[PDB]
Design an enzyme around this catalytic site. Structure first.
Site, PDB file in Angstrom:
ATOM      1  N   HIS A 160      -0.373  -4.019  -2.808  1.00 37.47           N
ATOM      2  CA  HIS A 160      -0.982  -2.819  -2.273  1.00 37.47           C
ATOM      3  C   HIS A 160      -0.947  -1.648  -3.236  1.00 37.47           C
ATOM      4  CE1 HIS A 160      -2.105  -3.850   1.865  1.00 37.47           C
ATOM      5  NE2 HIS A 160      -2.968  -2.907   1.540  1.00 37.47           N
TER       6      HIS A 160
ATOM      7  N   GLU B 201     -12.300  -0.794  -7.206  1.00 40.26           N
ATOM      8  CA  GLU B 201     -11.445  -1.865  -6.712  1.00 40.26           C
ATOM      9  C   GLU B 201     -12.265  -2.854  -5.891  1.00 40.26           C
ATOM     10  OE1 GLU B 201      -9.206  -1.253  -3.076  1.00 40.26           O
ATOM     11  OE2 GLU B 201      -9.636   0.887  -3.136  1.00 40.26           O
TER      12      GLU B 201
END
EC number: 3.1.27.-
Length: 108
Positions: free
Chosen positions: A100, A71
């Site tokens: 999120h 990520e």
């Protein structure tokens, strides 16, 4: 500095690495980043967090043999981290999340 969804996604598929304004959480911590204080820009100006492995515990991202997910933060400039992330596999699938890691959509 390259920190947009499209900029980063195109960089990854092309050069197979994050642009150099990125550092892992570990590297940031070693330079005095304190997540609870939102101070990344003071200790590493122009850097964003990215390159750490993503667990995919909830198995929302497509799984495969030998596939690793990492990520990187997107749209970060200063302060506390935001909720925008690019998720990229070792075979260069690129997904985004803006909530999120709750929902993911393909962008490459």
């Amino acid at each position: 500095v390259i920190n947009t969804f499209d900029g980063v996604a195109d960089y990854l598929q092309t050069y197979h690495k994050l642009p150099d304004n990125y550092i892992t959480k570990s590297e940031a911590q070693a330079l005095g980043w304190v997540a609870s204080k939102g101070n990344l820009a003071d200790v590493a100006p122009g850097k964003s967090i990215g390159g750490d492995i993503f667990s995919n515990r909830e198995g929302k991202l497509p799984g495969k043999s030998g596939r690793t997910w990492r990520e990187a933060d997107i749209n970060y400039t200063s302060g506390f981290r935001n909720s925008d992330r690019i998720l990229y596999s070792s075979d260069w699938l690129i997904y985004k999340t803006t909530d999120h890691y709750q929902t993911f959509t393909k962008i490459r």
